[PDB]
Design a protein around this nucleic acid. Structure first.
Ligand SMILES: [Zn+2]
Lengths: 94, 61, 56, 226, 116, 175
RNA sequence: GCUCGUAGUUGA
RNA sequence: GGUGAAAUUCUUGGAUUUAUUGAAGACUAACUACUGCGAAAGCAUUUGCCAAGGACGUUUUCAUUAAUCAAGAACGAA
C-alpha cells in the first residue's frame, strides 16, 4: 500500500452491490484505481465516474468480502495521490 | 434531441426524486462511452443543455 | 509404511518425552503450533472502549 | 438393566444400520422448496481474513454443488451460509454451518470441504477454558502435538481423525467414535493428564477388539488404571 | 392449506429423539426415540433407528394433519459436545422423504458461557 | 532487579524467541574486556547473565579473545575465562584476529546470526556494527550494573516482516 | 512462587 | 443414561423429551489471543466512582542516588 493516501469520497448509498460516493476530492480519479481506508486496507476499486462538474460522484467496485450494506453514511474512502488527475484535462483546451 | 424511456430496477420511495435526479444530470457531465460503442472509452465531458421529464410510472417503473 | 509398527517404536523409544493428505501430520510443519500477534491491519471495524471515550 | 422394553420383531442382523443412502432431488417428496430461509453465521479471527479473501470463490463453488449461498463480510468479520430455493437437502445447511466454522479454526479448505460428505463429522473443542495460567496452558497444549508432532500422529492414526490444534480450539474431523475419543483425550490433556496414558489405552482397546471372545466380558482387568 | 408443526431432534452420540410439537411446544403430537426401533443399545444412535423413528413420527403427523414442520436440531451441549449425533441427519432426510415440507432449520444446542 | 527493566528485558527476549527462535538455554559469547572488568570489579558473570536473561546460560569464548587474555598476562582473567566451556574458532594461532573481528566472524555469517548467539561485550563500535546485524542481543556491564541493550531496528523490521509472512503463509497459504 | 528489603560485597 | 459392549442407576407413583415459573452456586459463547495489561497470582456483559500505571517525546537541584542481597515484610499458593 502507498504511504500517502488522500480522502476521495464520502458514502452516499449502495446501488446494485456498488458503493456510490460523493467526491470530497477536487481531482478526478484514475479508472480502476484502488480505494482504501485510513487503515490503508483496500475495500475495492473505482468502477464508474459520473455526475456534473460541480458535484462529482463515483461508484466503487467492491472486492471479495466487502459488502456495500456494511458501510454507513459519513464513511470516508481514500485514494492514492498518484491515482488522481486534474479536471482541466477533460475540459476542452482554449 | 432524444426522447428516452428509463427502466428502474426497483420502485422509488419518492416519485419526485426521479425528476430531481434528472435536474442533477443537466449541464456539463462526466461520461464514459459504453462497451457497445465503437468510440474509445475514455472519460469525457458532455453538455446536456435542457431536459424535461415527460411521464413517470412508479408501478410500471 | 504401516501405523502399528510406528506405534510400538513410539512407546519403546519414549518419543512423547522431549529429547534432551487425510491427516495433519502428513502436512509438513505440523509440529509447530502457529501463534499470531495481537494486532493486525484489518478491514474489521473496531469499537472504542468506554475508558477511551471517557478520556476523550 | 432397562425394564419396560417391548420386543422389536422387525430388527434383524441383515440390515446394515450405519449405511447412508444418497439424498437426491427426487428424495424430497414434498416437491416444494423450503418454506423459509435458514441461515447460520459465525465470526472468524482477523488473521484468517486474507486467506478467506483468497479462497472464498472456491468456497462458493463448493456450496454451489449443494445450492447453499455464502456471504463473507470482512467489515463485520463474519461468514454466513443460507439455504436457497434450489436447496433440497435439509441436512446440508448444517454441514455448511460446520464448514465455515472449520474455516474459522485454521483448517485448510481442501480438508474442510470434506465435511460436505455424508460419512464425515467434525468437533471443535475449546481448550482455553480449563486453566487460567498461560505457561501451564501452553505446556498442556504442546503435550497434544508432542515432540516433532509424533504424539499428534499417534492420535491421528488411533482415532482416524484429522486433528488441528489452533489457539483455544482443537478441530477434529472423522468418524463419531474417533470424535468421542479425541474429545476424551483433549479434555483429559487439559486437566493435567498426559496423552500417553490414553494412547496406551487405545492400543490395548484396539488389540482387544480383534479378539472375538473378549467382546462380551469387561476389559477393565486388561486396561491399566490411570 | 399448510399446517405447521415443529420437529425437535435431539441427536446425541448415544441416542436420537424425534419430537413433533406445535409452534409453542406446549402440546406435542408424536415423540419417537431411536431406542424404540432397535433391540441393542449400541444401535440407538444408528441412522437406521433414526430413519425408522422419523418415518413413524411423520406417519403420525400425516394422520393428524401436519403437512410441514419447522426444524430445531439439537446436540447434547453444555459441558459436553456440540456436534449433533449421526441420527440427526438421518431423521431430517427421512422426514424429507416422508413428504413433509421443511420450514426453518435452526440449531437449539445449549451453549454455555463455557466456564464452570 | 527492578520489575520495570525486567519486564522490558522479558519483552525483548519474547521478540527474539518468536522471530529468531531463541531457545533456553541461551548461548552467550563473552569478550575479554568483560572478563577483565568482572575480574577487577569482582562481578559474578554467569550469575549476572542468568539474572539478565532470566533463564539458563551457556558461556563461550574464542581463540582470539582468550589469546589476548594471555597477552595481558592476568592469571585471574585466564582462570575466569577457562571456567567457561570452550568453543573453537577457525583462525591462525600465530596471527590471531582482533577480538571484535573474531567475534563477528563467529556471529555474523552472510549478514545473519546463524548460530543464534548472544554477544556480551564491552566494546562500543562492535556493538554498533552488531546492531546492523539483525537478531543479536547485546549485553554490557556498566558501573557494576549489567544492562541488556534495547531491540535494534533491524530486529524490529525482521519481526514485522515475519508477522506479515505469517499472515499469508503456513496454514494461511492459499496454495 | 513474585516483589520490596537489612548485615556483607562491588562501583562510586 | 452410559459404554468397546455392558453394568450401577431413574422409570405407568410417568423416567427421558417439550413448554412455563421459582430457587441455588457459579461463568461472560464466537470475536480471542504463546506477541495486549499486570511483579507474580491472574485479567473481556453494561454504566458510574476511586486511586495507580506502561510505552513515546521534551527534559531534570538529578549518583556517597546504583548493582548483588542472608534476616525480615506485602501479595499469591497452601
Ligand atoms: Zn578467532
Amino acid at each position: 500500500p502507498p504511504d500517502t493516501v488522500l480522502e476521495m469520497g464520502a458514502f452516499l448509498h449502495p446501488c446494485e452491490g456498488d458503493i456510490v460516493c460523493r467526491s470530497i476530492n477536487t481531482k478526478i480519479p484514475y479508472f480502476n484505481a484502488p480505494i482504501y481506508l485510513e487503515n490503508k486496507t483496500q475495500v475495492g476499486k473505482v468502477d464508474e465516474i459520473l455526475g456534473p462538474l460541480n458535484e462529482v460522484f463515483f461508484t466503487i467496485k467492491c472486492g471479495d468480502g466487502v459488502q456495500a450494506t456494511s458501510f454507513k453514511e459519513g464513511d470516508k474512502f481514500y485514494i492514492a495521490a498518484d491515482k488522481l488527475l486534474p479536471i482541466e484535462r477533460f475540459l476542452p483546451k482554449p | 434531441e432524444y426522447v428516452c424511456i428509463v427502466r428502474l430496477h426497483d420502485a422509488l420511495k419518492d416519485e419526485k426524486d426521479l425528476g430531481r435526479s434528472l435536474e442533477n444530470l443537466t449541464g456539463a457531465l462526466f461520461q464514459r462511452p459504453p462497451l457497445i460503442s465503437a468510440v474509445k472509452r475514455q472519460l469525457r465531458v458532455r453538455t446536456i443543455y435542457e431536459s424535461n421529464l415527460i411521464e413517470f410510472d412508479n408501478k410500471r417503473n | 509404511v504401516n501405523e502399528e509398527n510406528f506405534l510400538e517404536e513410539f512407546v519403546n523409544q519414549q518419543a512423547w518425552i522431549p529429547k534432551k493428505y487425510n491427516f495433519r501430520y502428513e502436512d509438513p510443519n505440523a509440529a509447530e503450533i502457529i501463534s499470531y500477534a495481537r494486532s493486525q491491519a484489518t478491514l474489521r471495524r473496531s469499537d472504542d472502549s468506554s475508558r477511551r471515550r471517557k478520556r476523550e | 438393566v432397562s425394564t419396560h422394553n417391548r420386543d422389536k420383531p422387525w430388527d434383524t442382523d441383515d440390515i446394515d444400520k450405519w449405511k447412508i443412502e444418497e439424498f437426491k432431488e427426487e428424495d424430497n417428496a414434498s416437491g416444494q422448496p423450503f418454506a423459509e430461509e435458514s441461515s447460520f453465521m459465525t465470526l472468524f479471527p482477523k488473521y484468517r481474513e486474507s486467506y478467506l479473501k483468497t479462497i472464498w470463490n472456491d468456497v462458493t463453488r463448493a456450496l454451489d454443488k449443494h445450492n447453499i449461498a455464502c456471504v463473507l463480510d470482512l467489515v463485520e468479520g463474519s461468514m454466513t451460509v443460507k439455504t436457497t430455493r434450489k436447496t433440497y437437502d435439509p441436512a446440508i445447511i448444517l454441514k455448511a454451518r460446520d464448514l465455515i466454522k472449520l474455516l474459522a479454526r485454521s483448517v485448510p479448505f481442501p480438508q474442510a470441504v470434506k465435511i460436505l460428505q455424508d460419512d464425515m463429522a467434525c468437533d471443535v473443542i475449546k481448550i482455553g477454558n480449563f486453566v487460567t495460567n498461560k505457561e501451564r496452558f501452553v505446556k498442556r497444549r504442546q503435550r497434544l502435538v508432542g515432540p516433532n508432532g509424533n504424539t499428534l500422529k499417534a492420535l491421528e492414526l488411533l482415532t482416524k481423525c484429522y486433528i488441528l490444534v489452533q489457539g483455544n480450539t482443537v478441530s477434529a474431523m472423522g468418524p463419531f467414535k474417533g470424535l468421542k475419543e479425541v474429545r476424551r483425550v483433549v479434555e483429559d490433556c487439559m486437566k493435567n493428564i498426559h496423552p500417553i496414558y490414553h494412547i496406551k489405552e487405545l492400543m490395548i482397546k484396539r488389540e482387544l477388539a480383534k479378539r472375538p471372545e473378549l467382546a462380551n466380558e469387561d476389559w477393565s482387568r486388561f486396561l491399566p488404571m490411570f | 392449506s399448510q399446517v405447521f408443526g415443529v420437529a425437535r431432534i435431539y441427536a446425541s452420540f448415544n441416542d436420537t429423539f424425534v419430537h413433533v410439537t406445535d409452534l409453542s411446544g406446549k402440546e406435542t403430537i408424536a415423540r419417537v426415540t431411536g431406542g424404540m426401533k432397535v433391540k441393542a443399545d449400541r444401535d440407538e444412535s444408528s441412522p437406521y433407528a433414526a430413519m425408522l423413528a422419523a418415518q413413524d413420527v411423520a406417519a403420525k403427523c400425516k394422520e393428524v394433519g401436519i403437512t410441514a414442520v419447522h426444524v430445531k436440531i439439537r446436540a447434547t451441549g453444555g459441558t459436553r459436545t456440540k456436534t449433533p449425533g449421526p441420527g440427526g441427519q438421518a431423521a431430517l432426510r427421512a422426514l424429507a422423504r416422508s413428504g413433509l415440507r421443511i420450514g426453518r432449520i435452526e440449531d437449539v444446542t445449549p451453549v454455555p458461557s463455557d466456564s464452570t | 532487579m527492578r520489575q520495570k527493566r525486567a519486564k522490558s528485558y522479558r519483552k525483548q527476549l519474547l521478540v527474539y524467541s518468536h522471530t529468531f527462535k531463541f531457545r533456553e538455554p541461551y548461548q552467550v559469547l563473552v569478550d575479554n574486556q568483560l572478563v577483565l572488568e568482572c575480574n577487577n570489579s569482582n562481578f559474578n558473570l554467569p550469575s549476572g547473565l542468568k539474572r539478565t536473561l532470566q533463564a539458563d546460560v551457556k558461556v563461550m569464548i574464542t581463540q582470539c579473545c582468550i589469546q589476548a587474555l594471555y597477552e595481558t598476562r592476568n592469571d585471574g582473567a585466564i582462570n575466569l575465562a577457562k571456567q567457561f566451556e570452550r568453543r573453537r574458532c577457525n583462525h591462525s594461532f600465530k596471527d590471531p584476529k582482533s577480538p571484535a573481528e573474531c567475534i563477528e566472524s563467529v556471529v555474523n555469517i552472510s549478514g545473519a546470526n546463524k548460530h543464534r548467539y548472544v554477544v556480551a561485550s564491552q566494546d562500543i563500535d562492535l556493538r554498533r556494527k552488531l546492531r546492523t546485524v539483525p537478531g543479536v542481543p547485546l549485553i554490557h556491564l556498566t558501573r557494576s550494573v549489567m544492562v541488556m541493550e534495547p531491540l535494534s531496528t533491524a530486529s524490529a523490521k525482521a519481526s514485522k516482516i515475519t508477522e506479515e509472512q505469517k499472515l499469508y503463509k503456513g496454514l494461511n497459504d492459499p496454495n
